[PDB]
Scaffold this active site. Sequence first.
Site, short mmCIF file in Angstrom:
data_model
loop_
_atom_site.label_atom_id
_atom_site.label_comp_id
_atom_site.label_asym_id
_atom_site.label_seq_id
_atom_site.Cartn_x
_atom_site.Cartn_y
_atom_site.Cartn_z
N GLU A 87 33.58 -8.72 -1.03
CA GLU A 87 34.01 -10.07 -1.33
C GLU A 87 34.46 -10.21 -2.77
O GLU A 87 33.68 -9.94 -3.70
CB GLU A 87 32.94 -11.13 -1.00
CG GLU A 87 33.36 -12.49 -1.54
CD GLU A 87 32.65 -13.69 -0.92
OE1 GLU A 87 31.85 -13.52 0.02
OE2 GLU A 87 32.94 -14.80 -1.39
N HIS A 143 35.90 -13.21 -4.06
CA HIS A 143 36.25 -14.63 -4.04
C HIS A 143 36.70 -15.16 -5.41
O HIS A 143 37.65 -15.94 -5.49
CB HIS A 143 35.06 -15.45 -3.52
CG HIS A 143 35.43 -16.81 -3.00
ND1 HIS A 143 34.58 -17.55 -2.21
CD2 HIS A 143 36.55 -17.57 -3.16
CE1 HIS A 143 35.16 -18.70 -1.90
NE2 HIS A 143 36.35 -18.73 -2.47
N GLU A 184 36.49 -13.40 2.16
CA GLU A 184 37.02 -14.10 0.99
C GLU A 184 37.48 -13.13 -0.09
O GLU A 184 36.98 -13.13 -1.22
CB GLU A 184 36.02 -15.14 0.46
CG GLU A 184 35.78 -16.24 1.50
CD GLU A 184 34.77 -17.31 1.08
OE1 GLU A 184 33.71 -17.01 0.49
OE2 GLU A 184 35.05 -18.48 1.39
N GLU A 215 33.22 -18.96 10.50
CA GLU A 215 32.32 -19.96 9.93
C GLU A 215 32.74 -21.37 10.35
O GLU A 215 33.93 -21.70 10.36
CB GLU A 215 32.30 -19.87 8.40
CG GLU A 215 31.81 -18.52 7.85
CD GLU A 215 31.86 -18.43 6.34
OE1 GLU A 215 31.73 -19.48 5.67
OE2 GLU A 215 32.01 -17.31 5.80
N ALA A 251 30.97 -25.75 11.18
CA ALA A 251 29.85 -26.69 11.22
C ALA A 251 28.87 -26.36 10.09
O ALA A 251 27.78 -25.83 10.31
CB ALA A 251 29.16 -26.65 12.58
N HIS A 252 29.30 -26.65 8.86
CA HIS A 252 28.55 -26.34 7.66
C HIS A 252 27.26 -27.17 7.63
O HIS A 252 27.30 -28.40 7.52
CB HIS A 252 29.42 -26.55 6.42
CG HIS A 252 28.89 -25.90 5.18
ND1 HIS A 252 28.24 -26.61 4.20
CD2 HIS A 252 28.91 -24.61 4.77
CE1 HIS A 252 27.89 -25.78 3.22
NE2 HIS A 252 28.28 -24.56 3.55
N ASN A 303 25.59 -22.21 -12.70
CA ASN A 303 25.01 -22.10 -11.36
C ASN A 303 25.59 -23.16 -10.43
O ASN A 303 26.16 -24.15 -10.90
CB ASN A 303 23.49 -22.23 -11.44
CG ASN A 303 23.05 -23.65 -11.71
OD1 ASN A 303 23.10 -24.50 -10.83
ND2 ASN A 303 22.61 -23.91 -12.95
NA NA Z 1 26.79 -21.82 0.20
#
Ligand code: NA
Lengths: 211, 211
Positions: A24, A26, A69, A145, A147-148, A205
Amino acid sequence: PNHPLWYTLCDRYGLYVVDEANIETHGMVPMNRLTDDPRWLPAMSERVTRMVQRDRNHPSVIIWSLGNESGHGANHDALYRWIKSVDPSRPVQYEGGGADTTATDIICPMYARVDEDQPFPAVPKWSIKKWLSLPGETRPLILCEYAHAMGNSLGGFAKYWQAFRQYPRLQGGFVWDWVDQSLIKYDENGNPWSAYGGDFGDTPNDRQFCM
Amino acid sequence: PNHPLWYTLCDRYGLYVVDEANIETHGMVPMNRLTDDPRWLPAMSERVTRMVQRDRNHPSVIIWSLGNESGHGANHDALYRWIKSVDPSRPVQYEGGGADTTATDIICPMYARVDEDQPFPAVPKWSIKKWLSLPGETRPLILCEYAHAMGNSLGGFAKYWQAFRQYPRLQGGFVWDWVDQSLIKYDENGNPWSAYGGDFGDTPNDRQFCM
Ligand code: NA
Ligand code: NA
Ligand code: NA
Ligand code: NA
């Protein structure tokens, strides 16, 4: 790739598994900066080929994934073909660069809605119903992915399932995700509490987005 | 086929025309009883071939139709192929036998709904959005008949148009229909009034269904 025991348990208990290479990128700008670069093909290839060499005898693994990603780069196409050649038994999927690239056997978008189009430039997320019938499109569609499930969520979940049942080529999806990535910390009295981003003095963060 | 002047007017004013053979065998049981019969191939052939011979030079004619509501018989397939051979310049469509048979270049259902399936045995009317993406299907979809405008009607018209604009391969349709088939009768005072089925002592009849 997961702990080796995971596959054994999925074999025996019965779960279909998408086995995904540890790639990844991203945070790159643009997302495919490394994955379209041949200098990075060797490192990427090892993450794909060594996964296949390890896990190819597990019946639970039904689909290989090229990662997540990392945009769509030429390195993805090369490694898509490598798998197709070495293991014809399993479809290969990859979502990067618009979820329907030449590096995927399955239209595998992330967070494409049921009815509503999201026509982002270069990488649109069409309504899943509409995506299936775009001129020339013939592949099945399974969301990598959807329906978060962040906090008080899963509103409109039934809308996905109605669509899945009505449309032969909509063959489901993978909810994001199973388990909150909260970590235990302890207060003055030694009592445990659930912590998220920033709670360890980590900066910058992304706070609660890990849950 | 219409009065010859109709095509001249559509050429000059600018309307796309579907030119349709004078073949309808709706009242047969089953509907294809005559159209699957090789004894009726000669009579059917003349109704198709003589139309094409007459109207082939009109720019307004853009699609040929094999007729209406005659089921799907082998005669349709024979005549579909005849037109494709004699005139490659125009697609051929025909709705009979489930709107997506081998005798049509265009998925051309009648009164298929936007979102709701109507799964009739043998001849289902799928949701138009669903129909496009059935396994193996690649053709455009244009309803030969939709939004039945009988009396106080056209409820849900906007739903079709929203779908047409959203889905590339949903390329519209033809409303049923343009003008009420009512006829003028006169009362005791010579005043004209609009009449329908049964008003001429015609029996059996289907009353207002001509309007
Ligand atoms: Na997350
Ligand atoms: Na399905
Ligand atoms: Na359209
Ligand atoms: Na009628």
